[PDB]
Amino acid sequence: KIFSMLEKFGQFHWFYGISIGQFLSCFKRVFIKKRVDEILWLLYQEVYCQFSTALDKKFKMIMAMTMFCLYKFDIESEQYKEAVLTMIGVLSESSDGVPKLNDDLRYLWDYVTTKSYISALNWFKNEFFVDEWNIADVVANSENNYFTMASERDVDGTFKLIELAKASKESLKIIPLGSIENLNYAQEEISKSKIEGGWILLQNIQMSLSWVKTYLHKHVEHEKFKMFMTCHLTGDKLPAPLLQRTDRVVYEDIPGILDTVKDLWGSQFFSGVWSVYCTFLLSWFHALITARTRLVPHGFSKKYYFNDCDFQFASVYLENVLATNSTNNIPWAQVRDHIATIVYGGKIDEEKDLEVVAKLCAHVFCGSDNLQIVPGVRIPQPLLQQSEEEERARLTAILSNTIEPADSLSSWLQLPRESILDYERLQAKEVASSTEQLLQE
Amino acid sequence: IQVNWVEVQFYWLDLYGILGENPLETSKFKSLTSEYKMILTIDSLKMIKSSLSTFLERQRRQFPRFYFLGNDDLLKIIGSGKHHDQVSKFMKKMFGSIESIIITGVRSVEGEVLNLNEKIELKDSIQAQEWLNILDTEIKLSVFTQFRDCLGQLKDGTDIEVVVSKYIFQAILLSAQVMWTELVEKCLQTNEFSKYWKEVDMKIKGLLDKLNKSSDNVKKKIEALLVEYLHFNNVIGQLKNCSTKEEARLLWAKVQKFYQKNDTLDDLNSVFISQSGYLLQYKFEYIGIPERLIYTPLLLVGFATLTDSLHQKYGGCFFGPAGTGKTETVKAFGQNLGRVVVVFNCYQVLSRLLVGITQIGAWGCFDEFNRLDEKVLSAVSANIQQIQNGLQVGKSHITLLEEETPLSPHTAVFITLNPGELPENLKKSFREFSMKSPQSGTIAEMILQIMGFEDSKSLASKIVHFLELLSSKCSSMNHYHFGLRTLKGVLRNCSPLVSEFGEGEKTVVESLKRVILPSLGDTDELVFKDELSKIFDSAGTPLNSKAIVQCLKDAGQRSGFSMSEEFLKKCMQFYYMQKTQQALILVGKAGCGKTATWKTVIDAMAIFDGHANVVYVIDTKVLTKESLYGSMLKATLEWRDGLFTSILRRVNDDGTFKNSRIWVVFDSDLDPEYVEAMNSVLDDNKILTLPNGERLPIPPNFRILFETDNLDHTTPATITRCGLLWFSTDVCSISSKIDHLLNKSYEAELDKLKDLISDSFDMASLTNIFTCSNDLVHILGVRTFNKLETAVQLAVHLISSYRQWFQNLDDKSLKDVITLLIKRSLLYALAGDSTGESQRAFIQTINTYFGHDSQELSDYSTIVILSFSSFCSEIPSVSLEAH
């Protein structure tokens, strides 16, 4: 039954397919680690632990809730099954009615009644499943040699891989692709690493899929040697024999707005005091618009991708504005229009999204004496007799002092709570609908 | 082997002119020429030419502009090193917008002439690359000195009408741009704008008055300069209405500004263009007098995003719905900076042109980058990614296409897309922009302002509201293009009508009728008429065309065609629509009357003008591509003449064809392959590009027609380029077609016989007969309108067979014989394509509707020699043997 569920998962996306031998090795892991009911429970925990990391967040919750449903339908009584299907139906807005009543059930009813969809979806993972595997756990407990990492756009696992390098004492050779010289360098470095060793990394094989499907299937126990491959979930389909021969892992984006501000601010090394202030405001605006992007049905109309190239373009534009102005009268309207229309609004085809970006630019780049960019913190204007090192010191201090509240998706992004609850309702509805479709057959 | 010997001789002479007259390949060529002089040597010469690519590549590297032409054409040009021919007539493909050389001058495609600073001596000893480089440098420095003395005259204080009639369009254009920028900056140092606004308004009025009375080329120049002068007026008017100085500074920084460096020792790099703080160097390349785009605010936004992309050496990507003007935006950006953007209408030729434009330094736009196959798309994406990676890192040289080639610092690559997308490698180094629908109101308003209409803003608003009402209310046909292209077509066709209808709403209404009404159905025509009554105040007063109508009626009477109201309407539409458009497309159902319509129009024009008419009915699909145009035989480098090329050569060489109107009718389906090779004549160029490179001119009276039945495989570009006339309903009645068929069958007691036959075809019973016949089940379903051509002809020929026994019988028996033959022909033509039981049912219907007084046609009845009998007496019993 669990393998049929995983086959149904693989029938949806090209990255979620599962082989029979993988499931049999996952079952062998139960007896390797250190009565029939305990073996069954360990099987459920081990399958979830080893096959959550190959799926994204929505399919993580779908798999967890379906596997909990299967185990509890086998173990518990009929009234338990009817109650759980009632809660799934009211989450999916398909069936209505109070459960016919257990601390877990009343906790879950308290979660559902107060309209907390995230808590209702995470209750299964919080209650039943114990262990969760990060990138280090899946790379350490793998006998495989080639690792394929997939993620959405505007997020990269390369920083996590360098963190693992600093943790596992290894050196990565990042190999960008896209040019024939880079292809020859990649082939030379793979030939070097397959003989000597060392962790070898490949970035974004999506545009080099031709070289991949002409080289890597034919190319596919060295010590301290693991090959990491990075692709994109939304890109073109990878070859099936290549996919079956590698340990597929999906890396997930951060939820922190202020963490994105820190990440953008720590990578800007220097161009006077006003350039530093403008770069700080640009980092905050980039983090705010990137955070607002991910709320696809409500924050925007479609899915856009404001990468670091847009930040580089806007930074060069701010540098050119600050350089060619000797009166220190910053043209705030000019930079607002050029950022909302040319830099960030260029790829936007809709009109409402352009209005959203224009409103965000008017709120962030207003250039007032006391700017409250979020409901939490206010950024004062710089003084004309301060060094750039002092300016960076006070900007770092005001970044470290402030904290991110629980409702940062509403207050910081300037969104009503109704939109957030409606988005969470849509997420829970599609998760529960997919679970019901899995559970009927 | 005569053709092989001729080809070998031609190859030997060409290569001797290329290299022999002025090492291993040279020795092999010398040995092969010695063997040919002693005497299948063609493959050896082809392999020698293939091995001579390194010398060919060095020749192409000597002067970069020679690279554009093909290998055969370049070999032909470099082989003619003494005659100084074929290089001036084919440098349009190299220089993009310059047609011929006058050295004392050059001629662009539009006909503008450039006067060089000084003459260049031409001699037979000078090779192609040296004098070509001298000509290029002299052209650029002549453009710079025209710039210089234009600013000398303008800063002197002279009038603009004296300098608009002297120098080329680029010089006066950029002189006006720089002068306007200086005045706007000087008046931005203060808060006074009305004086220079009034001055440029008076300049606009003076250029309009000079436009009214000058020649055609000068008229084109004044139009292309009034576009920018109206833009200057718009910018100054916007800056005048600004409340604060900050808003004025914002508006001035948004628009495109021009400056000149007065301190650099260099000349061609003394101009930088400022837009939102970024700088670009003007190139001083020649473009001619092209169709200047109307500077809408979205055009300035497109210029701003292309400037922002090119400041950091990123490519420019545009995407959006088709028809929003992205290709023209890129071209206008290129020609605003005085350079020609090379257009690749989307592997060997593509990457060849790509390395050519990255070696020359000219900008290249990949228009419609959504139609290539996956492998070539990915590989050219890798090529452009390599080019952009070289440009961003400032590499002096690039290893592109497995050769080491220099990288020009001014090379840029642009992409336009038509979704309804850019690959990852390209998107890592390109800037995507999504331009919206263009301001049709502003474009139409400015076009009307140049054209001299006293009411421009309200009239343009009414026109765009009318077109949007038709796009929202009419049916969703595949050929209903109501975008900006057809609006510009309406405005362009408003130009010949003003000489008789005047600058006003009436000309717009009449041209709107003439180029919108033909391409609509029936309910669409009703909607068009109602909306034209509602929006435009003019009711569409009739014009004076009684002479043409009478000529049409005389043509119909002498050709047998009757004149219904709808046939008259279609003929008048076709005539008024062929008065302006060169190549026309006639569409409609099968057998609806297209050929009759245009034949009647031709006869009417022949009577009205007294002018000779030549018709070449050439079906498109009956000739192959080689037979219709021409085939270059690769066996011996020979040429074969196609039919259309042969008749163009015959009409060009000619004294009969110099005083005649010659018409080519393509009376079959529209093939995309047969028309994409014809695209060179459909536009205003009117020049046919043969596969061998021959350019045959087409006279203005050489009017092309088309005649098909469907448009599902016709490109929308050819739909807009050619005129489309739609036959929604038949141009005939049943009685009129019957009368014409009778008349042509008579032409192909006689008067009494004709009168009796015509009186026997009573329309009252015939309409019911045809209505009953249309309800039956017919195999290979053909309309009754296309069965009348047999139903009349069969009866006419049967009576023509029985005419010689018609002088020895009574009148009633003659009427019975005529009626029986008519009933038999009606049976075997209308219901003659159905079952026997249905044929018998049609006999019962015929006997019911033609009355019992007439002779009752039986199921097996006939006429034997005359007496009435059946076929049962005509059956011979056959005694067959065993084997």
Ligand SMILES: Nc1ncnc2c1ncn2[C@@H]1O[C@H](COP(=O)(O)OP(=O)(O)OP(=O)(O)O)[C@@H](O)[C@H]1O
């Ligand atoms: N004014 C008219 N009065 C009477 N009959 C007419 C008139 N105009 C056309 N017809 C008839 O229409 C018939 C249709 O033939 P025609 O040559 O016009 O077809 P067409 O337009 O070439 O059709 P297709 O190419 O689709 O076969 C003619 O045979 C002619 O008898």
Ligand SMILES: Nc1ncnc2c1ncn2[C@@H]1O[C@H](COP(=O)(O)OP(=O)(O)O)[C@@H](O)[C@H]1O
């Ligand atoms: N700003 C403008 N001024 C004048 N004409 C314009 C302008 N923008 C677009 N057009 C007209 O719109 C027409 C359609 O452009 P088109 O070639 O279809 O663009 P694309 O190929 O990118 O869709 C062109 O013939 C052009 O003359």
Ligand SMILES: [Mg+2]
């Ligand atoms: Mg285009």
Ligand SMILES: [Mg+2]
């Ligand atoms: Mg025809």
